[PDB]
Amino acid sequence: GSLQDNSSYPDEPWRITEEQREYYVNQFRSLQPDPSSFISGSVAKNFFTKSKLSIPELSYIWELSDADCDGALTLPEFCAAFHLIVARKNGYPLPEGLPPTLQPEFIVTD
Numbered sequence: 001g002s003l004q005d006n007s008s009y010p011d012e013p014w015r016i017t018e019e020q021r022e023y024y025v026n027q028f029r030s031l032q033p034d035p036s037s038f039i040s041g042s043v044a045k046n047f048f049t050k051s052k053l054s055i056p057e058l059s060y061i062w063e064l065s066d067a068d069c070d071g072a073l074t075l076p077e078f079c080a081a082f083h084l085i086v087a088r089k090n091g092y093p094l095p096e097g098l099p100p101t102l103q104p105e106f107i108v109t110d
């Protein structure tokens with residue numbers, strides 16, 4: 001009788017309407033003086049550490065953020081970067097992140 005589920009609202013395309021993009025730019029802006037422009041790579045990876053709680057696990061968070069070894073990410077690029085950081089403080093399981101995806105650490109399945 002407890003734990004119900006009369007609500008339907010999946011998530012993927014990050015669909016929205018100035019409801020999340022506003023808070024997404026207010027952060028990337030705290031460091032980026034320009035309205036949009038692009039933030040550096042070592043600069044964003046410096047504060048990005050604020051969710052995984054201890055254990056520096058930003059190695060996979062950034063590996064997915066950057067996509068051209070440019071060590072930089074325009075504002076549009078940061079829009080997805082933070083989307084991955086919230087997944088930790090949100091409690092969302094890890095769907096993907098690396099090319100592989102089966103048992104790179106559990107060979108013996110028995």
Ligand SMILES: [Ca+2]
Binds near residue numbers: 066069070072073074
């Ligand atoms: Ca990039």
